[PDB]
Swiss-Prot record:
Organism of derivation: Homo sapiens
Consequence when changing residue 139 to H: Impaired activity
Family label: Belongs to the alpha-carbonic anhydrase family.
Protein name, as recorded: Carbonic anhydrase 2
Enzyme class: lyase
Effect ascribed to mutating residue 61 to W: Impaired activity, rescued by 4-methylimidazole (4-MI). Impaired activity, not rescued by 4-methylimidazole (4-MI)
EC number: 4.2.1.1, 4.2.1.69
Cofactors demanded by this protein: Zn(2+); Co(2+)
Binding note for cofactor: Zinc. Can also use cobalt(II) with lower efficiency, but not copper(II), nickel(II) and manganese(II).
Ranges for domain Alpha-carbonic anhydrase: 1-256
Location(s), subcellular: Cytoplasm; Cell membrane
Length: 257
């Protein structure tokens, strides 16, 4: 099955998921000089004060911090969006080296990691229905650069030892995702896809221009996770990013001048 290795990595996915060669695939390079300022773009509305985190899971390609999405608790609105999107999970993509790891790039620059806060459009009733719709998901993407530690990330880092291998999960209640956001909510936005199989073309991408800083030790502990399950040969969970895909007939808009 699919993964990030030489024999099952992004270059192979199209054989099981032909949409990998589609017209609105993610991630993309964000050419900041070609992205046009759109003065009609509204500010983002990130309402996370009532977020209810539940669990953290090693799913064999990343770790997901999952939320209660059975009610409107943590929601994304505004920006390019119509309607209300419920937070269901966030996860990261990261590198084996500080100089790579993000999925989106900015003027071809790669960050050490990228955070994805995944939300689904409540008008479709549940997550599984939403991913079948071209406006089903809104993913808030946030770059991570290596520098000073991010205090609000440390509770995530601390628990990774307990979910080292594929299929392990741990209680993760009372985590506040507001501690993962940068100061500014200026963003770029474009229509795209899931960056992992099934690669469905259901995502409005909202990528924050301001990265967050994490410490070398924080990302180091990301890289001690495992792709494999317990009892199998150890494969470090590193370089779980898909590279930039052709922009094709899309325009990236900027919320800011
Ligand atoms: N990396 S990303 O674009 O933010 C992202 C990628 C994939 C999913 C996801 C994962 N597994 C699925 C299984 C069945 C249906 C939809 C799925 C979506 C959810 C979010
Ligand atoms: Zn992702």
């Amino acid at each position: 099955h699919w993964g990030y290795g030489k024999h099952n990595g992004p270059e192979h996915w199209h054989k099981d998921f032909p949409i990998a060669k589609g017209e609105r695939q993610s991630p993309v390079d964000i050419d900041t000089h070609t992205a046009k300022y759109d003065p009609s773009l509204k500010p983002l509305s990130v309402s996370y004060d009532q977020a209810t985190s539940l669990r953290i899971l090693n799913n064999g390609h990343a770790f997901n911090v999952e939320f209660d999405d059975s009610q409107d608790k943590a929601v994304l609105k505004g920006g390019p969006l119509d309607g209300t999107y419920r937070l269901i999970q966030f996860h990261f993509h990261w590198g084996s080296l500080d100089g790579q790891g993000s999925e989106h790039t900015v003027d071809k620059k790669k960050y050490a990691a990228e955070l994805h806060l995944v939300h689904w459009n409540t008008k479709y009733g549940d997550f599984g229905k939403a991913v079948q719709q071209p406006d089903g998901l809104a993913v808030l993407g946030i770059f991570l650069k290596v520098g000073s530690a991010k205090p609000g990330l440390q509770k995530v880092v601390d628990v990774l030892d307990s979910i080292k291998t594929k299929g392990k999960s741990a209680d993760f209640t009372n985590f506040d995702p507001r501690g993962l956001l940068p100061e500014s909510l200026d963003y770029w936005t474009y229509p795209g896809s899931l960056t992992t199989p099934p690669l469905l073309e259901c995502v409005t991408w909202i990528v924050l221009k301001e990265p967050i800083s994490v410490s070398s030790e924080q990302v180091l502990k990301f890289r001690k996770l495992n792709f494999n399950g317990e009892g199998e040969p150890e494969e470090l969970m590193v370089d779980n990013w898909r590279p930039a895909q052709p922009l094709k007939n899309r325009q990236i808009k900027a919320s800011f001048k």
